[PDB]
């Protein structure tokens, strides 16, 4: 717990804040990257299930994958409120170490295939959890930092929690197939190629690191003392998680024949870098004028991907994920853009607006690290709009299509409502 923290007197930072708040930091991703590794579960295990006792329609699929966001996003909103109340130490380890709960329930349910899907979702919301675990961290590193630093740090911690989906799309898809638990009696299915598929591995992988990092929470990790934006973060960043979530499912219903967890990871890998430098990018080369060019391209392979289909176009795939990758680099700028605009434009209006009418570079760092709360609440609405669109149109019609039209009509449609405000 501290109590002097002065992150601002030059000297105090540069023989002190930067030596804590670059300790917190490291501490902060990890209990991040983590916590969306965990988020995002439902990418991988939902493709596989079938593939042990497992037959579920793949609408139910799809509602899987789609199920944490909605927990997620209501649960981004109190998330906010609780390391005011309970601080970066205390916090962050209850709501990593919260974790394991679901994480070891599912290695159980994928363990016992007469188990019904009304448990999947139970835990699918149960990892939704692990996806609020964003509004504390975000506004949290926020206060170890300068406002001159609040903003590569907020996006290193923003960058690298984006991260975790895609290291766990490639490491769980590879874990199932080595018998890393059965030592513990960790049942699986011998595959054709003769190898096990143990698919509890990809989650209990997650136990001990979990663990690991919620001890490194308990040490290292101290203390301290208009709505319309954020339908644009929705757009650039439901799009992330959206596609990272409802994809590899969608790689399965399209081209049945690839196999694509051992790909899939990329996609997220490729987008997680595409939301940082997408702020740094935005300074130091424009800003508003990136979020369109942006918005006019998800716009453009929202519309060209209609050609990469089984069908339309001769079934390429190696077009269907060449496209995905267009779309995961652009919903990953914006986020990244989007999030930065938000902030400045945050700390403009309570810095001037209330200071200016009317200690504002103080109910305003610490009043930006909270309107972070509604932005990514809403933000965190898409990946359950996505995956859901899709599991649905393959429902009620048996393609995509409704989905991606209504996608194709969305990046449009904003690509639109920026020009009026430009």
């Given at each position: 717990l501290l109590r002097d923290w002065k992150p601002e007197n030059p000297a105090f930072w540069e023989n002190k804040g930067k030596h804590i708040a670059r300790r917190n930091l490291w501490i902060s991703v990890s209990c991040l990257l983590l916590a969306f590794c965990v988020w995002m579960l439902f990418s991988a295990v939902t493709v596989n299930l079938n593939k042990i006792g497992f037959n579920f329609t793949t609408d139910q699929l799809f509602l899987l994958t789609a199920l944490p966001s909605v927990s997620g996003a209501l649960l981004r909103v109190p998330y906010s409120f609780m390391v005011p109340i309970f601080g970066g130490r205390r916090w962050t380890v209850f709501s990593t170490a919260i974790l394991i709960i679901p994480c070891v329930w599912l290695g159980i349910a994928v363990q016992n295939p007469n188990t019904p899907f009304g448990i999947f979702i139970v835990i699918a919301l149960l990892c939704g959890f692990a996806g609020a675990n964003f509004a504390s961290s975000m506004g949290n590193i926020s206060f170890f930092f300068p406002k001159a630093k609040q903003g590569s740090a907020l996006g290193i911690n923003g960058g690298l929690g984006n991260l975790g989906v895609s290291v766990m799309q490639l490491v769980a898809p590879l874990v199932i197939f080595v018998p890393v638990f059965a030592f513990l009696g960790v049942n699986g299915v011998p595959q054709?190629?003769?190898?096990?598929?143990?698919?509890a591995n990809a989650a209990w992988i997650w136990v001990p690191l979990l663990a690991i990092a919620t001890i490194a929470a308990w040490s290292g990790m101290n203390d301290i003392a208009l709505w319309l934006l954020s339908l644009l973060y929705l757009a650039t960043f439901g799009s992330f998680i959206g596609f990272s979530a409802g994809f590899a499912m969608l790689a399965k219903t399209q081209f049945p024949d690839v196999n694509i967890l051992r790909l899939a990871f990329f996609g997220p890998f490729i987008g997680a870098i595409a939301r940082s430098v997408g702020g740094a990018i935005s300074d130091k080369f424009g800003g508003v004028r990136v979020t369109l060019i942006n918005f006019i391209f998800m716009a453009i392979f929202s519309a060209l991907?209609?050609?990469?289909?089984?069908?339309?176009?001769?079934?390429?795939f190696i077009a269907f994920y060449a496209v995905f990758m267009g779309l995961f680099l652009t919903a990953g700028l914006g986020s990244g853009s989007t999030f930065q605009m938000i902030a400045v434009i945050f700390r403009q209006i309570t810095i001037y607006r209330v200071k200016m009418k009317g200690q504002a570079h103080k109910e305003a760092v610490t009043e930006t690290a909270a309107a972070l709360g509604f932005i990514s609440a809403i933000g965190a609405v898409g990946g359950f709009f996505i995956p859901q669109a899709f599991g649905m149109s393959l429902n009620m019609t048996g393609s995509p299509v409704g989905a991606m039209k209504v996608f194709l009509i969305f990046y449009i449609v904003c690509v639109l409502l920026t020009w009026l405000v430009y």
């Open positions: 054709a190629d003769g190898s096990v598929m143990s698919l991907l209609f050609l990469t289909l089984p069908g339309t176009g001769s079934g390429n």
